[PDB]
Amino acid sequence: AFRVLKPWWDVFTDYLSVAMLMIGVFGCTLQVMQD
Amino acid sequence: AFRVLKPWWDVFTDYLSVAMLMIGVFGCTLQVMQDKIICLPKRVEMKGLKTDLDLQQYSFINQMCYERALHWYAKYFPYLVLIHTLVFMLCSNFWFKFPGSSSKIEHFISILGKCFDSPWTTRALSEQAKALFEKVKKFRLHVEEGDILYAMYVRQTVLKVIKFLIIIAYNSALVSKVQFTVDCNVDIQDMTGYKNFSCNHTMAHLFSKLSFCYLCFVSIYGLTCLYTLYWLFYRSLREYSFEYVRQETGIDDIPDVKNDFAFMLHMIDQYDPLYSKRFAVFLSEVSENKLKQLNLNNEWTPDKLRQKLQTNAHNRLELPLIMLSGLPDTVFEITELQSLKLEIIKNVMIPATIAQLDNLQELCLHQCSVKIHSAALSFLKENLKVLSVKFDDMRELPPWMYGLRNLEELYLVGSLSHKNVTLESLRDLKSLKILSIKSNVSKIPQAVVDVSSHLQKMCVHNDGTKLVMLNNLKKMTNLTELELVHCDLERIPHAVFSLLSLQELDLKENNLKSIEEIVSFQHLRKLTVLKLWYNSIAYIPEHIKKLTSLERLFFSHNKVEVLPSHLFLCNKIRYLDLSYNDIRFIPPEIGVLQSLQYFSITCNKVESLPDELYFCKKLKTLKIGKNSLSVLSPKIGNLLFLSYLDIKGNHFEVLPPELGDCRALKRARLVVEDALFETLPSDVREQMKADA
């Protein structure tokens, strides 16, 4: 339903998206803070 | 699932990774918070050294020299450590995060936990696990073809080792690079009026010390890998041999395991030494057999066995068995059965408990590969009297049956020639008296000669095999009853002429056409019963009158059309089978057959009945059958002892009332047309059916 529909490449893309989202949030934080 | 997969070194590596992650996060926090460079112009009673620089210039200089002079690695160290720790964690977790191997790992965890959970494992070492054996065998067949999980784990370990080596190699040189104080000569002159600056940032010494401690952790981490690497390359975990469960519990099953299975076994043993012992039980086949035995004992009750008890053909209390996987023990509790019946029961082992069933003398076996115990075999030798065996490819034949001395009657249903029969010698059968064979043997085996000293009755009913060599039958001096049914001889064999002790002769389905050997039958004065079923005989030689001892005659389903007068000279004949023949006229000489009690001419061409036939008052069975009789003589009322009459299928118009004179014949024994029976008076039919 929420797990059996994810091939390995899909899982890797999801993890890459999570990492990129974290990077973007951290970048926004630092831009607000010290830029 | 999430805990039992961690060896001690793995847990230590995880804890080191956690500590390194905490250190990296703390370093990033301090770098964001207090990592500030203070800078001053370098080259210049002591007074102050005012530089008339405003705060904006100070901050600008701090930023400029921070970008320029400060070492890149010194600035990136917290993020560097964070990245390395995250990569180590990711390469540690991808072992279970990859679904293709994660499914196998989860299946192994589930099966191991379920096997350890079963108390029947402890019972075997000392309920539903029987079906769990199927999952066990499915897993062992499917996953032993893997070993890719081991390669993946080895690759992960190699990656960790390489990362550790690189980390040490470059950090060792880079640690000495950082300094607390620093100098920067940037071209800010004529922009800020200065070029040379002395600077320092707070974290340096701390970072230095911090980095030192971090290195130590990494060092231990690397050492950990080495140990595991050595453990990977000193034991050769691709193969695992128990050699301890086999020696202690005394089980020779569970020989070895494949690369993947040995790897998982080693991992579990390092995690827990007793989990492997508990999990190995369901690999054993003997354990599976015993668990099936327990389940069968739960399924079977003595009540079920006694309900299935019945009376066999040869007047014995028998327990039929049609589909079983072994011997229930409860069967040995019921000693009143005199016979046992087995049908399609392979892999049967008879223990000494068969000695409990004292009152056993017969056994029936239908397609069963059975072996006995020593006490079981001795009990069978000393107690069995009758035995019936059915086998298809000689594999169900138990050889020890040839060693049973007290056996009396034996029945064999199975081909032996498939032309020499692979029959074992019948020497130990010291009390064999009756033999029955259902095979395709072309020549009589020599083994029977080893039993002819006490053999009394040999029955061989082949499916049509021609008995070319009958020389051994001449050795049957003690044979009193002989049957050669469907032996395809087509002539009376010369060997039977050597059997003076013979009493009853049967030649069914031999298709005898010329029988001019009846004179030789005069050499045998004990011939009371002679049988010629399903032969091509059309004429009866006069020599048959010379058989003094004849008591029964058989000519059913033959080509005899007009029967000779001299055939009636054997006044001692009591059974006369003339049905299914071309018999048309019954000669009056049948009146001299006073001793006759049987006469069947069913499915013949008989058109009239002589009155002399009714002089044979001893006739208790008369089977006219399907003939062409138009009227029945009233003299049938004189046959006071006639018990069966079969005239249905004839041309009778009205049955005579004299049928009421038949004391031994009733409605059930009277086979007549319903209209013919209706032609009888009301009193006659009332007397036949009931007692008025």
XYZ file of C-alpha atoms in Angstrom:
727
model
C 0.000 0.000 0.000
C 2.811 2.360 0.969
C 5.898 0.101 0.820
C 5.472 -2.600 -1.850
C 5.276 0.011 -4.636
C 8.887 1.221 -4.290
C 11.568 -0.238 -6.569
C 15.164 0.249 -5.507
C 15.681 3.180 -7.873
C 12.522 4.791 -6.495
C 13.846 4.425 -2.941
C 17.179 5.941 -3.977
C 15.391 8.868 -5.634
C 13.315 9.409 -2.492
C 16.443 9.425 -0.323
C 18.178 11.844 -2.695
C 15.110 14.088 -2.555
C 15.170 14.008 1.253
C 18.862 14.936 1.293
C 18.303 17.766 -1.193
C 15.365 19.075 0.847
C 17.514 19.069 3.985
C 20.283 20.896 2.116
C 17.841 23.506 0.830
C 16.332 24.090 4.269
C 19.793 24.467 5.803
C 20.772 26.880 3.037
C 17.663 28.983 3.618
C 18.416 29.025 7.346
C 21.985 30.198 6.801
C 20.858 32.787 4.244
C 18.426 34.219 6.790
C 21.003 34.061 9.582
C 24.494 34.980 8.383
C 24.217 35.971 4.694
C 15.030 -8.899 13.131
C 16.638 -5.722 14.451
C 18.762 -7.015 17.359
C 19.877 -10.621 16.759
C 21.927 -9.639 13.683
C 24.615 -7.691 15.576
C 27.917 -9.327 16.533
C 29.861 -7.616 19.290
C 32.215 -5.892 16.850
C 29.196 -4.632 14.906
C 27.705 -3.138 18.079
C 31.041 -1.521 18.931
C 31.255 -0.028 15.435
C 27.709 1.301 15.794
C 28.571 2.920 19.130
C 31.745 4.436 17.677
C 29.682 5.797 14.786
C 27.204 7.325 17.241
C 30.031 8.978 19.182
C 31.592 10.310 15.973
C 28.227 11.663 14.812
C 27.739 13.443 18.137
C 31.253 14.891 17.926
C 30.671 16.106 14.374
C 27.343 17.721 15.252
C 28.913 19.452 18.255
C 31.789 20.656 16.086
C 29.384 22.057 13.500
C 27.462 23.810 16.278
C 30.606 25.410 17.683
C 31.796 26.380 14.196
C 28.491 28.150 13.564
C 28.477 29.767 17.004
C 31.947 30.843 18.129
C 34.358 30.087 15.252
C 35.431 33.703 14.852
C 38.771 35.009 13.601
C 40.249 38.079 15.270
C 42.662 40.007 13.055
C 45.003 42.935 13.600
C 47.558 44.726 11.419
C 50.895 42.989 11.820
C 53.850 45.281 11.144
C 54.372 48.487 13.110
C 57.325 53.557 27.968
C 54.853 51.754 25.704
C 51.513 53.326 24.815
C 48.463 52.031 22.987
C 48.491 51.065 19.332
C 45.296 52.623 18.011
C 44.680 51.768 14.359
C 41.791 54.252 13.874
C 39.772 51.464 12.245
C 36.019 51.318 12.702
C 34.064 48.181 13.527
C 32.955 47.700 9.919
C 36.583 47.485 8.813
C 37.301 45.023 11.617
C 34.497 42.717 10.493
C 35.571 43.056 6.857
C 39.149 42.119 7.736
C 37.932 39.172 9.798
C 35.919 37.855 6.853
C 38.707 38.469 4.338
C 41.477 36.769 6.287
C 39.094 33.990 7.345
C 38.465 33.201 3.691
C 42.122 33.636 2.725
C 44.475 32.542 5.487
C 42.477 29.930 7.386
C 42.997 26.399 6.118
C 40.151 24.922 4.095
C 40.269 21.627 5.987
C 40.399 23.490 9.297
C 37.115 25.177 8.379
C 35.483 22.084 6.860
C 36.506 19.659 9.625
C 33.076 19.487 11.356
C 31.201 18.933 8.091
C 33.979 16.557 7.018
C 33.527 14.393 10.119
C 29.749 14.592 9.736
C 29.931 13.369 6.136
C 32.305 10.516 6.964
C 30.141 9.362 9.872
C 26.998 9.544 7.734
C 28.646 7.496 4.981
C 29.770 4.900 7.527
C 26.232 4.698 8.913
C 24.751 4.400 5.417
C 27.130 1.616 4.397
C 26.379 -0.169 7.671
C 22.601 0.104 7.207
C 22.423 -0.722 3.482
C 22.957 -4.375 4.423
C 19.369 -4.471 5.705
C 18.028 -1.496 3.718
C 18.369 -3.315 0.372
C 15.005 -5.080 -0.135
C 16.335 -7.865 -2.367
C 18.446 -9.244 0.471
C 16.212 -7.782 3.195
C 13.414 -10.181 2.240
C 15.766 -13.150 2.651
C 17.066 -11.770 5.951
C 13.528 -11.306 7.287
C 12.569 -14.816 6.167
C 15.621 -16.253 7.932
C 14.835 -14.288 11.095
C 11.224 -15.473 11.095
C 12.131 -19.119 10.509
C 14.880 -19.117 13.150
C 12.633 -17.466 15.726
C 9.801 -19.895 15.028
C 12.123 -22.910 15.235
C 13.633 -21.717 18.518
C 10.105 -21.051 19.802
C 8.954 -24.642 19.240
C 9.225 -26.768 22.418
C 9.122 -29.876 20.235
C 12.750 -29.062 19.411
C 13.579 -29.580 23.089
C 11.368 -32.679 23.159
C 13.307 -34.167 20.235
C 16.607 -33.218 21.877
C 15.444 -34.851 25.121
C 2.489 -29.700 17.321
C 2.312 -27.385 14.306
C 6.071 -27.637 13.686
C 5.314 -30.532 11.325
C 4.033 -28.130 8.665
C 6.849 -25.741 9.614
C 9.296 -28.402 8.405
C 7.979 -27.635 4.910
C 8.889 -23.962 5.279
C 12.276 -25.063 6.637
C 12.991 -27.243 3.604
C 11.708 -24.580 1.200
C 14.051 -22.036 2.781
C 17.021 -24.411 2.723
C 16.448 -25.187 -0.958
C 15.836 -21.578 -2.022
C 18.434 -19.668 0.005
C 21.411 -22.050 -0.196
C 21.568 -20.904 -3.841
C 22.450 -17.371 -2.714
C 25.755 -16.402 -1.044
C 25.379 -12.961 -2.631
C 24.473 -11.586 0.806
C 27.876 -12.706 2.097
C 29.565 -10.970 -0.840
C 27.582 -7.788 -0.177
C 28.592 -7.819 3.491
C 32.235 -8.411 2.550
C 32.078 -5.496 0.104
C 30.632 -3.270 2.833
C 33.451 -4.271 5.184
C 36.028 -3.573 2.465
C 34.510 -0.135 1.863
C 34.679 0.615 5.587
C 38.325 -0.496 5.696
C 39.238 1.667 2.698
C 37.450 4.674 4.185
C 39.299 4.189 7.473
C 42.655 3.893 5.700
C 42.080 7.061 3.669
C 40.816 8.916 6.747
C 43.920 8.054 8.756
C 46.282 8.701 5.850
C 45.110 12.229 5.144
C 44.052 13.324 8.641
C 47.487 12.399 10.012
C 49.084 14.989 7.735
C 46.246 17.515 7.970
C 46.093 17.730 11.783
C 49.539 19.323 12.004
C 48.521 21.819 9.308
C 46.174 23.792 11.563
C 47.586 26.462 13.871
C 46.114 28.721 16.524
C 47.850 31.864 15.306
C 48.095 32.736 11.618
C 49.235 35.514 9.300
C 47.617 36.876 6.145
C 49.125 39.329 3.656
C 46.147 40.239 1.485
C 46.083 43.207 -0.881
C 43.674 45.291 1.178
C 46.212 48.119 1.300
C 44.868 51.257 -0.409
C 41.497 49.632 0.295
C 41.755 49.394 4.079
C 45.243 50.916 4.278
C 46.857 47.675 5.466
C 48.206 44.460 3.956
C 49.784 42.351 6.719
C 47.617 40.912 9.502
C 48.126 38.674 12.519
C 45.012 36.651 13.305
C 43.748 33.791 15.421
C 40.517 31.858 15.806
C 39.199 30.388 19.021
C 38.457 26.762 18.149
C 41.919 25.888 16.832
C 43.545 24.331 19.894
C 40.219 22.827 20.945
C 39.681 21.539 17.414
C 43.241 20.232 17.439
C 42.654 18.347 20.673
C 39.198 17.354 19.449
C 40.572 16.070 16.159
C 43.206 14.082 18.033
C 40.549 12.299 20.067
C 38.517 11.707 16.915
C 41.515 10.054 15.276
C 41.800 7.673 18.218
C 38.196 6.579 17.739
C 38.752 6.008 14.032
C 41.874 4.010 14.844
C 39.937 1.645 17.090
C 37.220 1.493 14.447
C 39.776 0.371 11.885
C 41.185 -2.197 14.289
C 37.670 -3.546 14.746
C 37.342 -4.070 11.002
C 40.701 -5.848 10.960
C 39.467 -8.337 13.549
C 36.316 -9.000 11.546
C 38.407 -9.119 8.382
C 40.669 -11.652 10.066
C 37.580 -13.531 11.220
C 36.417 -13.375 7.608
C 39.743 -14.742 6.345
C 40.812 -17.268 8.990
C 37.745 -19.481 9.392
C 36.460 -19.700 5.776
C 32.844 -19.275 6.852
C 31.533 -20.636 3.521
C 31.156 -24.086 5.122
C 29.825 -25.082 8.540
C 29.987 -28.585 10.017
C 28.264 -29.139 13.352
C 30.219 -32.208 14.546
C 28.811 -31.478 18.029
C 25.045 -31.942 17.715
C 25.752 -35.116 15.736
C 28.108 -36.450 18.417
C 25.940 -35.475 21.397
C 22.347 -36.030 20.247
C 23.484 -38.964 18.092
C 21.888 -37.808 14.828
C 23.736 -38.440 11.565
C 21.429 -36.135 9.589
C 22.038 -32.421 8.948
C 25.388 -33.013 7.182
C 26.483 -29.516 6.124
C 25.315 -26.151 4.780
C 26.101 -23.978 1.769
C 27.994 -20.669 1.706
C 25.017 -18.459 2.571
C 23.715 -20.874 5.204
C 27.140 -21.372 6.787
C 27.607 -17.593 6.845
C 24.277 -17.057 8.607
C 24.997 -19.930 11.002
C 28.359 -18.406 11.929
C 26.758 -14.996 12.454
C 24.054 -16.440 14.712
C 26.555 -18.551 16.667
C 28.703 -15.482 17.296
C 25.521 -13.684 18.349
C 24.247 -16.667 20.362
C 25.789 -20.163 20.607
C 22.535 -21.942 21.547
C 20.245 -20.421 18.910
C 22.065 -22.443 16.240
C 21.595 -25.632 18.272
C 17.879 -24.942 18.664
C 17.463 -23.999 14.992
C 19.340 -26.989 13.547
C 16.694 -29.472 14.745
C 14.198 -28.891 11.926
C 16.872 -29.654 9.328
C 16.898 -33.260 10.564
C 14.823 -35.674 8.496
C 14.554 -38.202 11.340
C 13.082 -35.464 13.528
C 10.518 -34.814 10.794
C 9.689 -38.533 10.695
C 9.204 -38.647 14.464
C 7.061 -35.500 14.419
C 4.908 -37.079 11.709
C 4.685 -40.182 13.903
C 3.490 -38.055 16.826
C 0.938 -36.275 14.630
C -0.319 -39.636 13.339
C -0.607 -40.933 16.909
C -2.668 -37.850 17.746
C -4.767 -38.456 14.622
C -5.261 -42.212 15.125
C -7.152 -43.771 18.038
C -7.759 -47.434 18.918
C -11.476 -46.775 18.406
C -10.851 -45.985 14.732
C -8.835 -49.196 14.372
C -11.522 -51.341 16.012
C -14.256 -49.732 13.902
C -12.337 -50.662 10.740
C -12.004 -54.242 12.011
C -14.022 -56.682 9.918
C -14.097 -60.303 8.759
C -11.785 -61.116 5.863
C -12.427 -63.551 3.030
C -10.746 -66.454 4.851
C -12.709 -66.059 8.106
C -10.432 -63.850 10.206
C -10.665 -60.586 12.131
C -8.750 -58.154 9.918
C -7.851 -54.454 9.998
C -7.744 -53.097 6.422
C -5.250 -50.314 5.723
C -5.522 -48.439 2.433
C -3.391 -45.280 2.836
C -0.846 -44.818 5.634
C 2.708 -43.534 6.021
C 3.876 -46.012 8.667
C 2.861 -48.177 11.608
C 0.710 -46.548 14.309
C 1.571 -47.936 17.730
C -2.090 -48.149 18.785
C -2.496 -50.935 16.212
C -0.266 -53.106 18.408
C -2.771 -52.638 21.259
C -5.460 -54.734 19.525
C -4.448 -58.396 19.738
C -7.832 -59.900 18.802
C -7.254 -59.420 15.063
C -6.176 -62.604 13.283
C -5.299 -60.949 9.954
C -3.836 -57.631 8.832
C -4.409 -55.903 5.493
C -2.058 -53.331 3.957
C -2.672 -51.456 0.700
C -0.219 -48.981 -0.860
C 1.820 -48.396 2.316
C 5.474 -47.671 1.555
C 8.398 -47.323 3.976
C 6.968 -49.627 6.641
C 9.110 -50.767 9.569
C 7.719 -53.465 11.868
C 9.095 -53.152 15.432
C 9.106 -55.761 18.190
C 5.664 -54.489 19.265
C 4.174 -56.910 16.723
C 4.994 -59.566 19.325
C 2.082 -58.100 21.302
C -0.384 -59.349 18.661
C -0.153 -63.024 19.567
C -3.383 -64.090 17.832
C -2.099 -63.264 14.336
C -1.840 -65.862 11.567
C -2.637 -63.988 8.328
C -1.295 -60.860 6.643
C -2.339 -58.981 3.503
C 0.096 -56.682 1.687
C -0.811 -54.620 -1.392
C 2.091 -52.614 -2.873
C 4.056 -52.194 0.348
C 7.827 -51.987 0.846
C 8.089 -53.396 4.369
C 11.036 -54.296 6.596
C 10.931 -56.063 9.951
C 12.693 -56.054 13.301
C 14.621 -59.061 14.594
C 11.948 -59.807 17.195
C 9.334 -58.914 14.577
C 10.838 -61.340 12.060
C 11.098 -64.118 14.651
C 7.481 -63.549 15.703
C 6.349 -63.699 12.072
C 8.345 -66.893 11.500
C 6.899 -68.551 14.606
C 3.301 -67.364 14.326
C 2.158 -66.551 10.785
C 0.135 -69.167 8.913
C -1.343 -67.290 5.919
C 0.102 -64.430 3.869
C -1.119 -62.371 0.908
C 1.291 -60.099 -0.973
C 0.745 -57.724 -3.900
C 3.775 -56.132 -5.567
C 4.263 -54.407 -8.922
C 8.013 -54.066 -9.613
C 9.482 -56.547 -7.085
C 10.466 -53.619 -4.854
C 7.558 -54.263 -2.464
C 8.640 -57.897 -2.044
C 10.155 -58.491 1.412
C 12.927 -61.101 1.128
C 12.534 -62.259 4.743
C 9.181 -63.803 3.776
C 11.217 -66.662 2.293
C 12.485 -67.474 5.802
C 9.115 -68.015 7.517
C 9.067 -71.687 8.499
C 5.548 -71.893 9.966
C 3.719 -70.292 7.021
C 0.989 -72.518 5.579
C -0.758 -70.561 2.796
C 0.865 -67.929 0.580
C -0.593 -65.715 -2.150
C 1.536 -63.808 -4.666
C 0.017 -61.148 -6.927
C 2.850 -59.777 -9.045
C 4.790 -60.547 -12.207
C 7.973 -62.596 -11.835
C 9.279 -62.999 -15.411
C 8.528 -59.516 -16.813
C 12.390 -65.730 -19.405
C 13.488 -66.728 -15.899
C 11.689 -65.629 -12.742
C 13.808 -63.911 -10.079
C 12.224 -66.061 -7.371
C 14.087 -66.838 -4.163
C 14.271 -70.463 -3.076
C 11.386 -71.765 -0.954
C 13.580 -73.895 1.313
C 12.907 -72.304 4.717
C 9.132 -72.627 4.159
C 9.041 -75.895 6.077
C 5.249 -75.870 6.592
C 3.978 -74.414 3.306
C 0.870 -76.285 2.193
C -1.004 -73.905 -0.130
C 0.617 -71.634 -2.726
C -1.018 -69.074 -5.022
C 0.869 -67.181 -7.738
C -0.332 -64.330 -9.980
C 2.645 -63.731 -12.274
C 3.921 -64.128 -15.847
C 6.399 -66.966 -15.296
C 7.077 -68.982 -18.454
C 8.734 -72.022 -16.838
C 7.961 -73.404 -13.382
C 10.630 -72.117 -10.968
C 12.996 -74.470 -9.166
C 12.155 -72.824 -5.825
C 8.871 -74.749 -5.719
C 10.868 -77.994 -5.924
C 12.427 -76.936 -2.609
C 8.942 -76.960 -1.019
C 7.326 -79.953 -2.776
C 8.262 -82.196 0.167
C 5.352 -80.734 2.151
C 3.549 -78.705 -0.527
C -0.077 -79.776 -0.905
C -1.632 -77.156 -3.207
C 0.150 -74.997 -5.788
C -1.953 -72.405 -7.606
C -0.528 -70.576 -10.623
C -2.958 -68.284 -12.466
C -0.918 -66.417 -15.046
C -2.411 -63.741 -17.289
C -1.859 -66.022 -20.300
C 1.824 -67.014 -20.131
C 2.543 -70.320 -21.849
C 4.032 -72.835 -19.402
C 6.644 -74.173 -21.803
C 8.763 -76.071 -19.252
C 6.733 -78.082 -16.731
C 9.481 -80.516 -15.691
C 9.541 -79.281 -12.087
C 5.851 -80.174 -11.694
C 6.880 -83.832 -11.975
C 8.759 -83.252 -8.698
C 5.486 -82.408 -6.893
C 5.022 -85.859 -5.379
C 3.222 -84.522 -2.292
C 1.028 -82.191 -4.366
C -2.598 -83.235 -3.851
C -4.281 -80.247 -5.533
C -2.936 -78.561 -8.672
C -4.376 -75.765 -10.812
C -2.852 -74.594 -14.107
C -5.143 -71.692 -15.031
C -4.456 -69.689 -18.207
C -1.119 -71.472 -18.661
C -1.714 -71.446 -22.449
C -0.673 -75.082 -22.788
C -3.462 -75.845 -25.315
C -2.871 -79.531 -24.504
C -2.894 -81.595 -21.325
C 0.690 -81.423 -20.005
C 2.653 -84.612 -19.430
C 3.818 -83.486 -15.972
C 0.367 -83.722 -14.356
C 0.337 -87.398 -15.366
C 3.153 -87.904 -12.828
C 0.967 -86.693 -9.923
C -0.785 -89.783 -8.583
C -1.690 -88.018 -5.320
C -3.555 -85.310 -7.240
C -7.254 -84.932 -6.443
C -8.661 -81.866 -8.243
C -7.534 -80.730 -11.699
C -8.238 -77.267 -13.118
C -7.274 -76.077 -16.615
C -9.158 -72.789 -16.896
C -8.563 -70.599 -19.968
C -6.116 -73.033 -21.574
C -8.292 -73.123 -24.723
C -7.967 -76.902 -24.921
C -9.143 -78.199 -28.297
C -7.778 -81.750 -28.584
C -7.892 -83.553 -25.248
C -6.878 -87.023 -26.393
C -4.779 -87.414 -23.196
C -7.756 -88.485 -21.043
C -6.391 -92.038 -21.203
C -3.397 -90.778 -19.227
C -5.877 -89.528 -16.620
C -6.785 -93.187 -16.041
C -3.286 -93.535 -14.574
C -4.506 -91.200 -11.798
C -7.254 -92.936 -9.815
C -7.683 -90.074 -7.310
C -9.170 -87.607 -9.832
C -12.440 -86.594 -8.173
C -12.727 -83.074 -9.644
C -11.688 -82.148 -13.192
C -12.059 -78.577 -14.458
C -11.783 -77.333 -18.046
C -13.055 -73.726 -17.880
C -13.048 -71.611 -21.052
C -11.654 -74.162 -23.491
C -12.339 -74.949 -27.146
C -13.542 -78.518 -26.560
C -16.306 -79.562 -28.951
C -16.289 -83.365 -28.522
C -15.922 -85.595 -25.455
C -13.783 -88.729 -25.988
C -15.121 -92.032 -24.710
C -12.038 -92.450 -22.490
C -13.636 -90.074 -19.963
C -15.921 -92.975 -19.003
C -12.865 -94.765 -17.572
C -12.233 -92.210 -14.787
C -13.689 -94.149 -11.866
C -12.988 -91.517 -9.200
C -14.798 -88.676 -11.003
C -17.235 -86.802 -8.758
C -17.503 -83.426 -10.524
C -17.375 -82.477 -14.212
C -16.764 -79.048 -15.762
C -17.354 -78.103 -19.408
C -18.547 -74.493 -19.146
C -17.975 -72.135 -22.092
C -16.864 -74.764 -24.598
C -17.735 -75.745 -28.164
C -19.545 -78.962 -27.210
C -22.734 -79.243 -29.274
C -24.053 -82.819 -29.006
C -22.895 -84.601 -25.859
C -22.085 -88.334 -25.971
C -24.057 -91.054 -24.235
C -20.941 -92.616 -22.684
C -20.294 -89.316 -20.881
C -23.076 -90.438 -18.521
C -21.293 -93.679 -17.573
C -19.578 -91.865 -14.666
C -22.528 -92.355 -12.328
C -20.539 -90.924 -9.394
C -20.513 -87.401 -10.876
C -22.291 -84.908 -8.606
C -21.390 -81.594 -10.292
C -21.912 -81.195 -14.044
C -21.161 -77.783 -15.573
C -22.515 -77.715 -19.140
C -23.648 -74.082 -19.361
C -22.622 -71.581 -22.049
C -22.248 -74.389 -24.594
C -23.992 -75.540 -27.772
C -25.872 -78.318 -25.964
C -29.110 -79.056 -27.823
C -30.461 -82.488 -26.820
C -29.971 -83.987 -23.354
C -29.693 -87.790 -23.742
C -31.897 -89.946 -21.489
C -28.760 -91.595 -20.054
C -28.570 -88.640 -17.645
C -31.153 -90.640 -15.690
C -28.388 -93.004 -14.570
C -26.622 -90.056 -12.883
C -28.496 -90.612 -9.635
C -25.656 -89.180 -7.519
C -25.730 -85.943 -9.532
C -26.669 -82.829 -7.561
C -25.621 -80.005 -9.934
C -26.537 -79.387 -13.571
C -26.169 -76.048 -15.368
C -26.965 -75.607 -19.064
C -27.477 -71.840 -19.030
C -26.970 -69.975 -22.317
C -27.239 -73.195 -24.343
C -29.546 -74.464 -27.096
C -31.517 -77.071 -25.125
C -35.041 -77.429 -26.528
C -36.486 -80.301 -24.469
C -35.818 -82.126 -21.204
C -35.869 -85.936 -20.918
C -37.945 -87.331 -18.078
C -35.031 -89.492 -16.895
C -33.383 -86.260 -15.727
C -36.085 -86.144 -13.041
C -35.074 -89.604 -11.797
C -31.976 -87.993 -10.222
C -33.732 -87.157 -6.961
C -30.432 -85.997 -5.416
C -30.379 -82.971 -7.751
C -30.463 -79.917 -5.484
C -29.310 -77.358 -8.087
C -30.687 -77.228 -11.641
C -29.664 -74.275 -13.825
C -31.527 -74.486 -17.126
C -30.758 -70.826 -17.808
C -31.183 -69.404 -21.302
C -32.383 -72.372 -23.359
C -35.133 -73.120 -25.892
C -37.474 -75.145 -23.675
C -41.095 -74.582 -24.682
C -42.666 -76.533 -21.796
C -41.389 -77.943 -18.501
C -42.194 -81.521 -17.540
C -44.318 -81.896 -14.374
C -41.911 -84.616 -13.179
C -39.763 -81.795 -11.770
C -42.094 -82.075 -8.781
C -40.478 -85.449 -8.080
C -37.172 -83.675 -7.306
C -38.041 -83.226 -3.640
C -34.520 -82.033 -2.756
C -34.146 -79.492 -5.578
C -33.159 -76.190 -3.958
C -32.289 -73.940 -6.924
C -33.969 -73.666 -10.328
C -32.923 -71.287 -13.127
C -35.219 -71.550 -16.156
C -35.697 -67.819 -16.785
C -35.096 -66.853 -20.392
C -36.952 -69.787 -21.965
C -40.122 -70.335 -24.012
C -42.359 -71.692 -21.247
C -46.044 -70.787 -21.498
C -47.484 -71.837 -18.118
C -45.375 -73.254 -15.325
C -46.888 -76.534 -14.095
C -48.410 -76.541 -10.588
C -46.142 -79.490 -9.701
C -43.480 -76.899 -8.828
C -45.350 -76.665 -5.519
C -43.958 -80.122 -4.733
C -40.458 -78.599 -4.440
C -39.751 -78.595 -0.705
C -36.173 -77.289 -0.923
C -36.918 -74.822 -3.750
C -38.394 -71.411 -2.926
C -39.070 -68.161 -4.765
C -35.528 -66.861 -4.231
C -33.993 -70.111 -5.504
C -36.488 -70.144 -8.406
C -35.325 -68.066 -11.371
C -38.361 -67.737 -13.646
C -40.072 -65.045 -15.661
C -42.514 -62.987 -13.612
C -45.366 -63.932 -15.950
C -44.260 -67.573 -15.761
C -44.303 -67.392 -11.958
C -47.738 -65.758 -12.188
C -49.021 -68.759 -14.164
C -48.602 -70.807 -10.981
C -51.654 -71.204 -8.724
C -52.128 -68.747 -5.879
C -51.468 -71.428 -3.254
C -48.205 -72.511 -4.910
C -46.787 -68.987 -5.078
C -47.969 -68.226 -1.537
C -46.145 -71.333 -0.293
C -43.005 -70.449 -2.261
C -42.893 -66.826 -1.080
C -44.044 -67.259 2.531
C -45.919 -69.575 4.918
C -49.484 -68.541 3.970
